[PDB]
Amino acid sequence: IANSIELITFERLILQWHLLYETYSSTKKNVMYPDFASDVEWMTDFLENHPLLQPPEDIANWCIRLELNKTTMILKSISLESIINSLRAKHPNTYIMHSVENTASGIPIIIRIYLRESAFRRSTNTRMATDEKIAVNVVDKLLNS
Amino acid sequence: MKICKACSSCMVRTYVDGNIIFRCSCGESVQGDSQNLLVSSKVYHTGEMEDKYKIFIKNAPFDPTNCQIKKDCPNCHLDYLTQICIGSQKIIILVCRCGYMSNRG
Amino acid sequence: RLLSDPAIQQLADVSNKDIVRKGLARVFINGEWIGCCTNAFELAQRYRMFRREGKIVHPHTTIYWDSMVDEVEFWLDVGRLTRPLLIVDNNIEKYNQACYKAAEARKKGDKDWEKHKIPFIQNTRFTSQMAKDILAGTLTLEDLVAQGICEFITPEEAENCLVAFSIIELRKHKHDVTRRFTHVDVPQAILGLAALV
Amino acid sequence: ITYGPIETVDNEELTEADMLSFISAAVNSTGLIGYNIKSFDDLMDNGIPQIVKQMFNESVQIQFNFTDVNIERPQHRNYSQGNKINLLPNKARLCGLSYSGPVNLAAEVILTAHYRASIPPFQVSTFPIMRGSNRCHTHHLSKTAKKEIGEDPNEPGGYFIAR
Amino acid sequence: EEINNRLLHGDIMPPIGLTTHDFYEKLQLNALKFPDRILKPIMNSINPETNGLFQMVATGAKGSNPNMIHIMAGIGQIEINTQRIQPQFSFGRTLVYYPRFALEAQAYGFICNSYIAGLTSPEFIFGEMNGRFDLINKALSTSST
Amino acid sequence: STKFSKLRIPWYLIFRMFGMTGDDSIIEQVVFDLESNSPVNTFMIEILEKSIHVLDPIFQPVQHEPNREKIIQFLSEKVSKFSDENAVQYLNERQLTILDKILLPHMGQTADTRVRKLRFLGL
Numbered sequence: 081i082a083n084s085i086e087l088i089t090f091e092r093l094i095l096q097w098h099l100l101y102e103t104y105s106s107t108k109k110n111v112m113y114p115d116f117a118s119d120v121e122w123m124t125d126f127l128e129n130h131p132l133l134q135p136p137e138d139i140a141n142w143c144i145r146l147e148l149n150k151t152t153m154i155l156k157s158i159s160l161e162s163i164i165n166s167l168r169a170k171h172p173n174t175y176i177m178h179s180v181e182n183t184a185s186g187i188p189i190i191i192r193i194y195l196r197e198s199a200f201r202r203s204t205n206t207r208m209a210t211d212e213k214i215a216v217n218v219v220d221k222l223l224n225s
Numbered sequence: 226m227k228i229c230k231a232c233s234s235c236m237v238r239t240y241v242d243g244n245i246i247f248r249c250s251c252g253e254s255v256q257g258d259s260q261n262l263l264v265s266s267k268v269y270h271t272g273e274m275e276d277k278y279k280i281f282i283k284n285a286p287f288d289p290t291n292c293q294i295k296k297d298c299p300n301c302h303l304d305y306l307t308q309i310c311i312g313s314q315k316i317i318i319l320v321c322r323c324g325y326m327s328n329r330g
Numbered sequence: 331r332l333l334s335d336p337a338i339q340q341l342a343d344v345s346n347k348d349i350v351r352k353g354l355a356r357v358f359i360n361g362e363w364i365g366c367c368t369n370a371f372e373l374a375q376r377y378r379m380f381r382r383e384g385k386i387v388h389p390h391t392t393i394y395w396d397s398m399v400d401e402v403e404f405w406l407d408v409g410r411l412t413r414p415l416l417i418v419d420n421n422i423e424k425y426n427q428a429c430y431k432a433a434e435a436r437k438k439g440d441k442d443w444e445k446h447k448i449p450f451i452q453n454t455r456f457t458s459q460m461a462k463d464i465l466a467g468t469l470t471l472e473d474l475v476a477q478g479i480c481e482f483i484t485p486e487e488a489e490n491c492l493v494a495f496s497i498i499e500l501r502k503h504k505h506d507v508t509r510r511f512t513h514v515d516v517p518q519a520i521l522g523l524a525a526l527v
Numbered sequence: 528i529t530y531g532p533i534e535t536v537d538n539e540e541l542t543e544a545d546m547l548s549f550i551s552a553a554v555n556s557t558g559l560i561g562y563n564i565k566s567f568d569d570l571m572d573n574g575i576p577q578i579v580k581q582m583f584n585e586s587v588q589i590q591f592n593f594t595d596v597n598i599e600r601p602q603h604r605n606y607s608q609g610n611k612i613n614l615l616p617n618k619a620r621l622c623g624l625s626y627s628g629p630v631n632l633a634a635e636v637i638l639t640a641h642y643r644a645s646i647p648p649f650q651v652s653t654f655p656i657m658r659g660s661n662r663c664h665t666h667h668l669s670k671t672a673k674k675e676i677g678e679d680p681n682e683p684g685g686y687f688i689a690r
Numbered sequence: 691e692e693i694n695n696r697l698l699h700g701d702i703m704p705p706i707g708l709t710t711h712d713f714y715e716k717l718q719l720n721a722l723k724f725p726d727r728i729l730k731p732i733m734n735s736i737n738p739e740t741n742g743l744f745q746m747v748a749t750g751a752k753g754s755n756p757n758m759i760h761i762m763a764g765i766g767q768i769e770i771n772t773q774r775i776q777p778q779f780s781f782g783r784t785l786v787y788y789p790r791f792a793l794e795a796q797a798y799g800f801i802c803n804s805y806i807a808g809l810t811s812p813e814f815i816f817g818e819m820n821g822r823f824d825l826i827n828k829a830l831s832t833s834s835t
Numbered sequence: 836s837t838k839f840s841k842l843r844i845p846w847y848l849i850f851r852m853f854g855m856t857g858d859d860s861i862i863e864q865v866v867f868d869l870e871s872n873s874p875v876n877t878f879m880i881e882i883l884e885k886s887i888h889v890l891d892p893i894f895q896p897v898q899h900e901p902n903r904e905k906i907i908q909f910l911s912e913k914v915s916k917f918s919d920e921n922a923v924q925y926l927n928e929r930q931l932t933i934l935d936k937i938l939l940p941h942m943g944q945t946a947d948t949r950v951r952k953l954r955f956l957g958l
């Protein structure tokens with residue numbers, strides 16, 4: 081029970097996060113960061129595996145690429161499915177993508193979260209604010225989920 | 226650090242129309258290559274930087290106030306080797322004047 | 331003297347890129363960055379030897395070598411607390427030479443390498459005769475400092491000193507290559523007159 | 528300077544009582560109370576000229592420079608109608624007069640005419656003098672001479688007498 | 691020394707939520723605590739009937755058992771804020787008398803002597819730190835109260 | 836000092852006044868290397884960018900000015916609260932001289948040492 085009740089935030093389930101400023105289209109090839117180019121492979125697999133989950137037409141061109149820490153997942157007994165479900169429930173504006181949940185050694189788990197224009201509806205939500213500040217705020221909210 | 230060609234000043238990244246454009250106080254805007262897509266980043270397992278102690282470990286054999294140990298040196302065959310305990314992880318590194326370093330150095 | 335010294339390189343000659351890449355060491359005097367040096371430890375040791383001789387460098391000048399950063403600092407301002415400390419000498423060079431000779435002997439397979447090695451010895455030049463002379467008034471701290479027996483140490487330089495708190499400690503680790511001491515401290519030195527009452 | 532081999536140093540018959548001799552020598556060399564008189568002496572000699580020099584300086588212009596400034600010994604004034612007397616600390620305490628000394632100021636002034644004063648050595652005022660310093664008469668005074676002066680020979684000095 | 695030897699070989703594996711340094715410090719603090727058996731020799735060298743100090747301590751008139759153990763049979767480990775002597779002198783040093791990253795207990799405030807036996811310079815210095823801390827805390831508490 | 840008291844002057848302004856022209860060289864004075872890819876260098880360069888781009892509430896008009904003369908003018912306006920070509924030159928030279936006197940006096944007291952001072956400042 082003590083383990084169950086203790087708060088586990090998303091921030092502690094990742095090794096690194098990169099704000100890439102990229103767009104993904106199921107039919108249109110888009111520019112991608114070089115060192116993260118190979119990512120494309122697993123993304124394709126995800127698209128093949130989940131017919132229902134496909135990129136929306138609302139993508140805002142901002143991407144958050146997260147590397148998950150398998151050791152922490154095993155220690156805390158958190159499955160990737162639970163993380164994805166909770167992230168989607170808490171944050172509906174974002175579009176979630178993940179690699180295979182095999183967790184085999186040598187194949188890190190990568191999660192790509194693409195913002196939608198819903199998060200950018202009124203960039204001047206209170207006062208004139210740029211898109212990248214809004215993206216940073218979304219990242220901060222995501223990590224504290 | 227994008228540097229304007231006309232002036233050696235920094236360019237801001239506008240992030241307009243999906244393409245990075247480097248604006249300067251004098252104008253002279255420049256397009257952005259795909260290597261410039263990354264907005265920001267953060268790696269949580271920072272630990273202790275290697276440059277954090279690079280110089281200190283380099284100078285450790287010559288520092289009188291450092292602890293010694295009676296283990297032999299594989300390279301130069303000296304009875305004593307300087308022992309350095311660094312980091313909250315308490316990493317023990319054995320070094321010598323000849324250049325031997327137990328930390329894969 | 332430092333500017334004329336070959337090791338010291340004037341700021342104009344050196345380049346920030348050279349400093350960062352070639353691993354040069356900044357040299358300061360009273361906080362003024364006068365130049366750069368290739369090896370901080372060698373320069374600090376050489377000027378410490380000069381101070382021990384007492385001709386090139388005044389005995390009351392602080393020489394500090396930082397290891398986390400390669401800077402070397404010389405201080406000569408007022409307000410520096412200073413205290414005399416007996417110098418500890420050793421035969422580490424001879425010990426290293428004997429160790430290398432023993433390693434070569436092992437390589438040759440003769441198996442007398444154990445005989446080649448010599449014991450390590452660290453001691454202080456202070457003797458009972460010097461104590462008797464001091465009590466008789468013949469010898470003074472100036473005479474000791476003129477010789478190599480003792481030298482003045484400041485809190486800045488004390489960061490580079492490993493001090494045995496008493497001669498008993500030095501004798502205990504006399505043949506311990508693991509505990510090479512730089513100085514010996516008389517215990518009563520850690521107390522004032524009122525406390526010593 | 529080459530030193531004798533450390534292996535030949537014979538000090539095994541050394542005891543903490545013997546090591547107390549080093550403390551005795553250190554205290555004798557430095558002294559119980561020091562560097563207050565020394566700090567004052569460097570002030571008086573070099574620092575005062577140093578600071579006054581640091582304070583150099585239809586538009587008539589007259590700057591003020593202090594190239595030369597000479598302090599003097601106490602020189603008790605108006606004693607028996609006498610400008611100069613060998614003011615002794617005991618007299619300063621008993622009478623209550625400050626144990627200070629005249630300060631003479633002589634220099635030259637720059638002359639500028641955009642659109643200079645000549646001063647002989649004069650005593651602007653007197654400056655407090657620490658007892659036991661070079662200016663004080665007690666310096667270079669024997670203990671019997673200290674008693675003849677009236678000061679306690681055992682006193683180490685280093686305190687001003689004023690008010 | 692056994693704990694230190696474990697440290698050299700890297701055997702110390704701290705538990706969850708504790709760094710290696712913190713676990714090592716806790717282990718060293720626990721290992722250096724005096725046993726109750728320390729009172730056996732003390733009670734063997736004193737006659738309760740004719741011992742003024744013991745009669746004063748036991749009857750509650752003055753003193754305490756720790757005072758007796760410090761006067762005779764050793765002061766033991768010095769603790770400040772339930773912590774050993776932290777390396778304030780320099781990076782990895784606690785005093786000018788010990789090397790950088792010293793491993794012996796004596797370098798961090800362990801006193802093997804008693805007040806009657808006599809304290810060496812480092813032991814006296816550590817005791818001085820502890821006593822001055824007690825005084826400073828008392829003054830601060832008085833002011834705040 | 837009495838002059839420039841309670842004035843929070845951005846560092847790159849100080850660098851530009853004394854002779855530094857390019858931002859690349861200004862960042863070099865602090866990092867000592869732009870080619871190096873050590874994490875310390877990258878993090879420091881990021882901080883220095885953030886300091887360059889941020890706009891100080893005072894010195895904002897002068898912030899982006901390429902001419903150091905104009906920078907010395909803005910500073911002189913701030914301190915002053917306490918032929919023109921010769922007047923601009925005279926006032927700018929005097930202000931630069933007084934800053935050379937009050938900025939790192941131990942490093943030097945003459946304009947010749949200005950570059951050295953800059954290096955030290957960067958350090």
Ligand SMILES: [Zn+2]
Binds near residue numbers: 229232250251252
């Ligand atoms: Zn430009």
Ligand SMILES: [Zn+2]
Binds near residue numbers: 300301321322323324
């Ligand atoms: Zn070696």
